[PDB]
Amino acid sequence: NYPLHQACMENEFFKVQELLHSKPSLLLQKDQDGRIPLHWSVSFQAHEITSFLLSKMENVNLDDYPDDSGWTPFHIACSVGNLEVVKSLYDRPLKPDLNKITNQGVTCLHLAVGKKWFEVSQFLIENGASVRIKDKFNQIPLHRAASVGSLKLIELLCGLGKSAVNWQDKQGWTPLFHALAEGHGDAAVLLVEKYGAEYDLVDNKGAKAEDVALNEQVKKFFLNNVVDA
């Protein structure tokens, strides 16, 4: 059915070469998922196969090849977290639009952050990716960083990224709510003390951030370590 895509998934470089020789028009053929062979080689981190495919896609803009979900091969690369592959897709004459969103409104940075891929996230920010693009849920990357409780990512986003801190998603939750709800006390304190997050904001249900804390232990830690403003 889809010989080339499969060979890419299996990481069978010999077969990929064979197939492209007998059926060249398969290079940009879409899946039942709307994916071309490159999506799969990147998805499964087939480094050598990816470079081979790219050598034959010199004039192809990756932005032009979204999944049936809105994911281009660059979105997949950032989600997988292999910085080598990410750099490989970026350092081309035709570069991808770093702020391009999927069908759900998320960016490559949203994807990398939620998976806690620090190196990739940094690479994206250093190259111009905006940290203030909201998805369908009105969340920016910082909402995800607080959710997974990554102190490094929070520092990266708020420091180098100059990320906004008090933006509320559709539930009325700022990143601080997410840190506490998930039990990330140190992350909650960091946002408030170092980056000025406000903790007196209320939910779409009138709840304060301290009110959605995972434990009474987490709540106590938070209240005990934040200064009144």
Q: Concatenated DSSP letters for the chain?
A: --HHHHHHHHT-HHHHHHHHHH-GGGTT---TTS--HHHHHHHTT-HHHHHHHHTT-TT--GGG---SSS--HHHHHHHHT-HHHHHHHHSSSS---TT---TTS--HHHHHHHTT-HHHHHHHHHTT--S----TTS--HHHHHHHHT-HHHHHIIIIIT---S----TTS--HHHHHHHTT-HHHHHHHHHHH---S----TTS--TGGG-S-HHHHHHHHHH----
> Domains, the chain, ranges and CATH?
1-229 (1.25.40.20)
Of the candidates 33, 116, 51, which has an alpha carbon nearest to the alpha carbon of residue 89?
51
Q: How far apart are CA 209 and CA 219, in angstroms?
A: 9
Q: How far apart are CA 94 and CA 174, in angstroms?
A: 36
Of the candidates 200, 156, 193, 151, which has an alpha carbon nearest to the alpha carbon of residue 174?
200
Task: Tally the C-alpha atoms within 13 A of residue 154's C-alpha that lie toward its C-beta.
Answer: 26
This PDB structure is determined at a resolution in Å of 2.3
Which tokens is 28 given?
A: 């940009």
Q: Which long-range contacts (CB under 8 A, 24 or more apart) does 217-224 make?
A: 218/180, 218/183, 218/184, 218/185, 219/180, 221/185, 221/189, 222/180, 222/185, 222/188, 222/189
Q: How far is C-alpha 12 from the geometric centre of its chain's CA atoms?
A: 28
Residue 26 φ/ψ, nearest 5 degrees: -85, -15
What is the radius of gyration, based on Cα positions, of the chain? Answer: 21
Q: How far apart are CA 152 and CA 40, in angstroms?
A: 30
Task: Residue count of the chain, please give it.
Answer: 229
Q: How far apart are CA 177 and CA 185, in angstroms?
A: 11
